[PDB]
Amino acid sequence: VTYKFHQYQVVGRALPSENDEHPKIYRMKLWATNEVRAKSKFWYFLRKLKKVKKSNGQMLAINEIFEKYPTTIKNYGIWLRYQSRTGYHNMYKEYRDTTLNGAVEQMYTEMASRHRVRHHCIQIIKTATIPAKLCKRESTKQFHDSKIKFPLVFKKVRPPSRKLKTTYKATKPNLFM
RNA sequence: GGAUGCGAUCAUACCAGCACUAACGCACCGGAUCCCAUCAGAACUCCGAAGUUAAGCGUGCUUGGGCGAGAGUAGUACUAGGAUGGGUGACCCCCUGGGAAGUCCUCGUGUUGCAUCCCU
Ligand SMILES: [Mg+2]
Ligand SMILES: [Mg+2]
Ligand SMILES: [Mg+2]
Numbered sequence A: 001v002t003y004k005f006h007q008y009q010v011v012g013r014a015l016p017s018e019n020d021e022h023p024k025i026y027r028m029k030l031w032a033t034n035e036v037r038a039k040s041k042f043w044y045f046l047r048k049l050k051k052v053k054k055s056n057g058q059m060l061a062i063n064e065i066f067e068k069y070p071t072t073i074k075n076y077g078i079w080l081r082y083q084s085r086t087g088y089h090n091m092y093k094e095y096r097d098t099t100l101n102g103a104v105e106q107m108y109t110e111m112a113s114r115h116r117v118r119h120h121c122i123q124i125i126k127t128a129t130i131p132a133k134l135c136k137r138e139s140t141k142q143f144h145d146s147k148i149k150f151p152l153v154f155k156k157v158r159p160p161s162r163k164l165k166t167t168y169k170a171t172k173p174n175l176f177m
Numbered sequence B: 001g002g003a004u005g006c007g008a009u010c011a012u013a014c015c016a017g018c019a020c021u022a023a024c025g026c027a028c029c030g031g032a033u034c035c036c037a038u039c040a041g042a043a044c045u046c047c048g049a050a051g052u053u054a055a056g057c058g059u060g061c062u063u064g065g066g067c068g069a070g071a072g073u074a075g076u077a078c079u080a081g082g083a084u085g086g087g088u089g090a091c092c093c094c095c096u097g098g099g100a101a102g103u104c105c106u107c108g109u110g111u112u113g114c115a116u117c118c119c120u
Helices: A035-049 A100-115
Strands: A006-014 A025-032 A057-065 A074-083 A088-097 A122-130
Touching (some): A025 A035, A035 A057, A074 A100
Antiparallel strands (some): A074 A122
């Protein structure tokens, strides 16, 4: 329904000129929180990869890409480049989610946690839906089990809403797995 | 199509080597009485028209040097503005903008005004 990160196809080109009346048309698949930020990052890469700045470029089309089957579970592989405190590195990550938007959200959260990498220090190189038999990370493999079975070792005790919250109770919580 | 006189632009026009040129020219060239000129008629000056296109001038050529233009170097280096951005610091990412320079590679090697004359 609502995602932190949205996937967009951005299409643009250099402004037509007398030497090139039909300049090459470039497309990118970019992740951003909305259309405005997707366009800005599109010109960032075109400026540094194709030497086409926004001042001498033309925005053609921008469309948001939605997950095809948002009700099933897919394995998503993400190839990314990120900047640490001392240089640049490449890494491959895998995630399980119903939509690639969720998998990308997990990637940003994980990078912030395990590496203290902020959002603007990450470039997504490639994304793909990996079949179960081609996954590489064990964090994803262990859930490829037809007889998946485990208990809830840690539960969160709380009333359904704060309406039923009281400071004092006559007895302690009764918990059992 | 060119030359000559005066030029403009001051190397795409310069430098080096090699090759070539009808006609009119431009030259080299002959002489030293006079003007003039020096150690020196070499130069300068004056007078001349036997000889020669050898040189100069002109044109062409060179996987030539230089010069000129493009491409590339490169959205790199650097830089204006922004952040209770990262980092111990040194420094650096990102955001709103601007944006170079050797090497290497390709191409080019003048254009043009007025007047007179030759090709006629
Ligand atoms: Mg003499
Ligand atoms: Mg000759
Ligand atoms: Mg040369």
